Amino acid sequence: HHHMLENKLGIINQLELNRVEERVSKENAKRLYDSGDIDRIEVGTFKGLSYIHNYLFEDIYEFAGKVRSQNISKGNFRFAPVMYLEIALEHIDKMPQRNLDEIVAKYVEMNIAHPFREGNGRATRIWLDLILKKELKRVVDWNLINKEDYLSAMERSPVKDLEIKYLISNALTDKINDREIFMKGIDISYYYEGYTEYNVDEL
Amino acid sequence: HHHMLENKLGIINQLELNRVEERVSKENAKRLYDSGDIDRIEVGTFKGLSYIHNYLFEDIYEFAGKVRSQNISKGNFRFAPVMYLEIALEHIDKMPQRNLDEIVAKYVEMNIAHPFREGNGRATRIWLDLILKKELKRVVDWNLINKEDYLSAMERSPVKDLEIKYLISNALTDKINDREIFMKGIDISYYYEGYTEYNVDEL
Amino acid sequence: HHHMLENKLGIINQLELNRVEERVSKENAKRLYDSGDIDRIEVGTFKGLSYIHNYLFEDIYEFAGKVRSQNISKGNFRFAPVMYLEIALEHIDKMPQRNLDEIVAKYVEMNIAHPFREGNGRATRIWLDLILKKELKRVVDWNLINKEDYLSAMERSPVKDLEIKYLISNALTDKINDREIFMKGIDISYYYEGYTEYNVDEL
Amino acid sequence: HHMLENKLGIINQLELNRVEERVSKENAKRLYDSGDIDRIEVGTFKGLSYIHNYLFEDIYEFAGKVRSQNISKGNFRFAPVMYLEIALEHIDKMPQRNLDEIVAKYVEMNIAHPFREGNGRATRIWLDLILKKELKRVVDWNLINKEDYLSAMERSPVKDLEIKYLISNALTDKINDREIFMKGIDISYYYEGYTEYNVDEL
Amino acid sequence: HHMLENKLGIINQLELNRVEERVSKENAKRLYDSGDIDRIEVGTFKGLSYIHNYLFEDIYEFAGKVRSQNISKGNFRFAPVMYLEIALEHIDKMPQRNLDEIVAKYVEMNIAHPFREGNGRATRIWLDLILKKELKRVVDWNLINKEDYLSAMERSPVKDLEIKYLISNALTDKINDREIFMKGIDISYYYEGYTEYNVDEL
Amino acid sequence: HHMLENKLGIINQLELNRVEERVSKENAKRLYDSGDIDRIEVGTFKGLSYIHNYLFEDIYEFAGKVRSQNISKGNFRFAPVMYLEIALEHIDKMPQRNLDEIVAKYVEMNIAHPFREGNGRATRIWLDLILKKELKRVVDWNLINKEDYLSAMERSPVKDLEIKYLISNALTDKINDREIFMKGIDISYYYEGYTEYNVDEL
Ligand SMILES: Nc1ncnc2c1ncn2[C@@H]1O[C@H](COP(=O)(O)OP(=O)(O)O)[C@@H](O)[C@H]1O
Ligand SMILES: Nc1ncnc2c1ncn2[C@@H]1O[C@H](COP(=O)(O)OP(=O)(O)O)[C@@H](O)[C@H]1O
Ligand SMILES: Nc1ncnc2c1ncn2[C@@H]1O[C@H](COP(=O)(O)OP(=O)(O)O)[C@@H](O)[C@H]1O
Ligand SMILES: Nc1ncnc2c1ncn2[C@@H]1O[C@H](COP(=O)(O)OP(=O)(O)O)[C@@H](O)[C@H]1O
Ligand SMILES: Nc1ncnc2c1ncn2[C@@H]1O[C@H](COP(=O)(O)OP(=O)(O)O)[C@@H](O)[C@H]1O
Ligand SMILES: Nc1ncnc2c1ncn2[C@@H]1O[C@H](COP(=O)(O)OP(=O)(O)O)[C@@H](O)[C@H]1O
Ligand SMILES: [Ca+2]
Ligand SMILES: [Ca+2]
Ligand SMILES: [Ca+2]
Ligand SMILES: [Ca+2]
Ligand SMILES: [Ca+2]
Ligand SMILES: [Ca+2]
Ligand SMILES: [Ca+2]
Ligand SMILES: [Ca+2]
Ligand SMILES: [Ca+2]
Ligand SMILES: [Ca+2]
Ligand SMILES: [Ca+2]
Ligand SMILES: [Ca+2]
């Protein structure tokens, strides 16, 4: 099934499975940074996002890095249905990214596409930071964006992106090669989704 | 200062604040159970829920156990306006709880009321288990309800409580004095809300 | 439970129960008209609506004529919460009914209140015809309002009442003492709710 | 669209409803008792179209054909005509190996809502055929309460847990039982507001 | 996107709004008085694009061209850019033989919302052309209250009865009356919050 | 008879709009230049009612008075008449010590929407008075684009974050600057579709 570690380690408690998946994927995130692999990823495309997703979740989620084949929703919002996900990703690949407005709009469209069965939030926040670094020489200090504010802004974003754009704009930092900003952002990004067991840099 | 530990322990990292609040409130939950205090609470009333909330969150959330003074929402759903909280809680105190249909309806209305600024989910799930134990001689084995299923069902519940009802009925157990069921349920209930650092029985 | 005939007569097929409830309640509607009792009902108040509802559904619906104690919804519209239902009804009793605009607004508010667990549509349409008869010397020729148009307009009416006002306006007739108009209207009103087995004037 | 309204000069909504119920239920009874139902392609729009035409030929104009107008129920907009064809192309390729996949496929076909009218009844017959082929089960529709079913279908474009739960709990292995089929036709029609006839009495 | 903001260095929103109103209403008056409006393809996106460019080429970047950004009003998300082409080609093939079909076509074109801005005013001109050609009618827009029209358009993706009713009760056979056209331009701009000028005084 | 300036026969919506703008903007200018604005209770429905009456008596029937009908915009239903009074009572007791509390109070007053019309313009004047008293700030409304403001207000019953950001970045310490007040009146009316007059030229 989708959680490849669930049967492998015979785990029947939701919290223990959550902790193990957090540990493995954060190990992978730490390696992605410390190996320098994060600097050799295509920026602003679904190919780069797919690479990030596979890197984080290979041997954790079945078909990591590959588009889902099932329709999904959060709250009352239906993400792009599978039937046109391909064309959605093509359109996102050609969207411009020369200023904060365009980059945030591109991030919002990629969240609407929501191409994977799981792991969209964490992978796409890494992807967004790479776009911001390449184009604005900034990255997000994610700790400066309150979790509940971020989630509300993303819920609002398919209709209007002003909330998420304001939060991102006020969280930007020029410390784009600072390892500490990256690792703290990984921990905050995982906390957004309900993973709080590990610090990435202690793995 | 709603997060009373933030200034007291000078915490500037969201994840660190989340972890300390989890530890303190889970210590309080373990004490609530092991002291037998949980057995001397009024069942199915706002008095009992307020007692549970204060017990869990005193010196963590300002005004623990007391009704909020601000309006709040999650997703697209606006909880009961502050101006009607009093009458909402009065109505809920009068709701019957003789079978699963009525108990689930009462739980759904209490979630709609959402009387506290924070901590509604965890406190109200403890409260619900007490109602089920008293009236049906059952409690919920929360690990049998998947987190995303639970959250979607609660989002659905103000419109129809069928989704939540099924989840609950399929998770009921007669092990109403099983400490392991209670503690595992505390851990799963906190996991529902994004706290995964501690096991309650290890504190 | 709520359908008293299910346990009373041990009917476990939904369609058979539906047919028996249609027969009994249409017998009651026919008696309500032919006895002249309909002419001695208070017009435009919840007292009159409750009298109609009890008359139709006594020994069919538990607590016929009495306000519901649980919250209900249709589609994604939540009708008036129980916690202020009485206040809503007290407001509706004082709403004016001097012309078509005001009568339609009053009908729309009564549908929002939706005071009974079931039977709101049929009872409140009888109630509305009485208001129109008293104040405008008109009643609705319900066959002139298409079922799907009526249902769509009622779904729209809590936001804007133009659709339902238009349909009603176009279907008004001055034959306010014509028995065939009344009986045909009973049949169409039940057809709106999915009852098609009987003609009321054949009972 | 209602071809019988002009033909029999009917001006009462309820009598038109009754005549359409009688004729289409006669067609459903024939579909089962003639054995035609057993040679319908399972799980494709081709099969659904065959069912819809069989039921509603000379009742609905263009029975068996995709609608050309957009439609909605409540505040839910069904698949726009502009990509309906594509929506059907995708549904034909959806897997149907377990209850999860079959329910997801049924939910997508309901979202597509390919016909002007008659989507509910035709697609419930279609769903039973899929369940019969892949799970050796069919739905005992009387075990699914009408209001629960309608609410679950309203919920299903967002989350299909409600409808999945209801279907799962209503499955029976009596996949060639004529009474189960006929009662299911009557309950399926009752869902949509037709209560005049019992199909096996026609 | 607003070319006149940088061109005339305007930093007051109201001042910019007035200048955009004046320039586009001058263009609308010329579109009518030159007879150019009579030589536009009726009922197609090509004609709508011509109207939009004619009104706004000096005001909006890429006037007459489909937008490249996704947009929304209220809680309604208009057709995604990725589908605009297929949506517009579908709209080009929609019939327009009676009021039902014409209103449905207008509703779909509003859902498509092909331009970044100016959809309301341009598409109302386009709609009158269709009504003039096919029904020998145009809309007397002053007979449709602004708030009723806006609510009806908000409702129209779900059900088009409100807007159909308003349009039907506002139709006039004065299809060549210059004052009906000019007053309609003024009312159409008023719908969108431009009230500074009368078009026929420019 | 709600639009007191209206008459019998067909009225032109645009001219009525212009006349109502002129009269109410004259009243707003007088409210400021007479110093009457300085004598208004701050942060209460009493003060809001005074503002609404001052702007709109002889324009709207029952200016300064609570509406008696339920109203909606988009798909949002404002506070029902049935509890409007309790809601205003609650709003009178809400704190206003910082921007978070003041924006929350403004958002609740907009949800209450106590008047039949004129809620936007009157309540924005009211909000500026609260901000002036408690923060020594007012809004430079020209710094908030119309479409951003309207979207943020649509969002505000769910989350006030959008509107709070816009207000926060538009605050100015020029709390007794006549230019800021008059420009803000013009922008506030522009938000609602009135663009004919400049207030200080009346
Ligand atoms: N209601 C919503 N509408 C749109 N986007 C949402 C909604 N809720 C959450 N999101 C986005 O989806 C992300 C979570 O996606 P998910 O697939 O669960 O990723 P992960 O596995 O990393 O948690 C959130 O971080 C947020 O960006
Ligand atoms: N969209 C929603 N609609 C209704 N109820 C919700 C929604 N989202 C979450 N909930 C309920 O609110 C609870 C969380 O409330 P919250 O005040 O955050 O408590 P806690 O501090 O324990 O997390 C969830 O457990 C769920 O039951
Ligand atoms: N989505 C909706 N929103 C508001 N009102 C509705 C909606 N759907 C139906 N209604 C109204 O509710 C009535 C049905 O009420 P119900 O309690 O089912 O009465 P009955 O038992 O007579 O069918 C319909 O006739 C219609 O007037
Ligand atoms: N709001 C909704 N959202 C999604 N699906 C719905 C909604 N309302 C009804 N449905 C589905 O549509 C079906 C009815 O479609 P319809 O075309 O009217 O068929 P029929 O002519 O057989 O009644 C229902 O059985 C239900 O499955
Ligand atoms: N919530 C909504 N849903 C659907 N359509 C809408 C909505 N709000 C406005 N519209 C339509 O959009 C038009 C406005 O489009 P816009 O691109 O702003 O045109 P303009 O620049 O001419 O004002 C309105 O006239 C109305 O027809
Ligand atoms: N959909 C909506 N939801 C919440 N608030 C809204 C919505 N639409 C408009 N508003 C608020 O209502 C105001 C308009 O109120 P209205 O009574 O028309 O006042 P006015 O007569 O001054 O224009 C807007 O300025 C905005 O603040
Ligand atoms: Ca997540
Ligand atoms: Ca740890
Ligand atoms: Ca929570
Ligand atoms: Ca730990
Ligand atoms: Ca009904
Ligand atoms: Ca019969
Ligand atoms: Ca139907
Ligand atoms: Ca019969
Ligand atoms: Ca506009
Ligand atoms: Ca002028
Ligand atoms: Ca307005
Ligand atoms: Ca002027």
Numbering used by the authors:
A (entry chain E), B (entry chain L), C (entry chain D): 5 to 207
D (entry chain A), E (entry chain C), F (entry chain B): 6 to 207
Original authors' sentences:
The most frequent PTM reaction catalyzed by FIC enzymes is the addition of AMP using ATP as a cofactor, coined AMPylation or adenylylation. Enterococcus faecalis FIC belongs to class III FIC proteins, which are comprised of a single FIC domain and carry an autoinhibitory glutamate in their C-terminal α-helix. We discover that EfFIC has both AMPylation and deAMPylation activities borne by the same active site. Furthermore, the conserved glutamate implements a Ca2+-controlled metal switch that tunes the balance between these activities without conformational change.
Two crystal structures were obtained by co-crystallization with a non-hydrolyzable ATP analog (ATPγS), for which well-defined electron density was observed for the ADP moiety. To understand how Ca2+ inhibits AMPylation, we determined the crystal structure of EfFICWT-ATPγS-Ca2+. In this structure, Ca2+ is heptacoordinated to the α- and β-phosphates of ATPγS (of which again only the ADP moiety is visible), to the inhibitory glutamate, and to four water molecules. Strikingly, Ca2+ is shifted by 3.2 Å from Mg2+ bound to NmFIC and ATP8. In this position, Ca2+ conflicts with the binding of Mg2+ to ATP, and it cannot interact with the acidic residue from the FIC motif (E115), which is critical for AMPylation. These observations explain why Ca2+ inhibits AMPylation and how it competes with Mg2+. In EfFIC, Ca2+ binds to ATP in a manner that hinders binding of Mg2+ to the canonical AMPylation metal-binding site, thereby inhibiting AMPylation.
